[PDB]
């Protein structure tokens, strides 16, 4: 608990300014926090599945890369 609260308000504001957003409502922050928690639940579920398949105890970068591969959200730079 409360590590999800570690996603701060000005961090979301920095992401919005990178996203080109001019003004930000006060309820944007908890919504973004929940959406990021859902996205992370999906990716970490896939990563834990890859890790437990590998009979290992250490999550590695390649497992996260293949998790994002089956997500469709394909990332480069870590393989």
């Amino acid at each position: 608990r409360d590590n999800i609260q570690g996603i701060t308000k000005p961090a979301i504001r920095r992401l919005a300014r990178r996203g080109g957003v001019k003004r930000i409502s006060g309820l944007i922050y908890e919504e973004t926090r929940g959406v990021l928690k859902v996205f992370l639940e999906n990716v970490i579920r896939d990563a834990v599945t890859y890790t437990e398949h590998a009979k290992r105890k250490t999550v590695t970068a390649m497992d996260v890369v293949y998790a994002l591969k089956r997500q469709g959200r394909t990332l480069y730079g870590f393989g």
Binding site: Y50, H53, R70
Partner: protein, 93 residues
Amino acid sequence: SRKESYSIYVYKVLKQVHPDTGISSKAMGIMNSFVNDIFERIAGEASRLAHYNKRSTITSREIQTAVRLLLPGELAKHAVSEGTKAVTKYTSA
């Protein structure tokens, strides 16, 4: 020359779970395309799992992992349960 679909197998499953329910031929083709789609999904996922761990042998563990990846939560849980049960049956016999 033999178009091998899953028609009689799906029909056996249909008369197993609903003996008073019919099925059209178009719906049978849809279920054939469905089974081929899910088979391609799980088989490609397990193939890539075999290439990740550098094993040349797909076993039930790889199919278990691919099912836990491809399906959503409780459906995957029930499917892993059914598969483990059936592999236990095939191992005991």
